[PDB]
């Protein structure tokens, strides 16, 4: 805890006139799409365990809440995410949701 005057990163700050020689800044939004696959890769995975510690049709309601507010993840930044990984995020919750209707057809009634 040195509680002193750190000025000299500015100094280094400098560095930032190389990266003005390469392509434009907007090739620097890429490395938010890291972000994604991360938050999302980690709420399906949830999903698809609270589906599985369900033991009736009252748990397993909560599990189609979860899955519709993942498809929302994607509707943020659907303008972002190339062709690729947006139909990746979208079908990848319907995946999700066979789990789901696996264990709510012997929960529920049937015909």
Do not use: C, W
Not at 39 to 58: I, M, N, Y
């Amino acid at each position: 805890m040195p509680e002193r005057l750190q000025r000299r990163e500015q100094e280094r700050q400098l560095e930032v006139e190389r990266r003005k020689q390469k392509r434009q800044n907007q090739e620097v939004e890429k490395e938010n799409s890291h972000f994604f696959v991360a938050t999302f890769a980690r709420e399906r995975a949830a999903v698809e365990e609270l589906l599985e510690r369900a033991e009736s049709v009252e748990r397993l309601e909560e599990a189609a809440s979860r899955l519709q507010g993942l498809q929302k993840l994607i509707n943020d930044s659907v303008f972002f995410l190339a062709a690729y990984d947006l139909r990746q995020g979208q079908e990848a919750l319907a995946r999700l949701q066979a789990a789901l209707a696996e264990r709510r057809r012997g929960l529920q009634p049937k015909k």
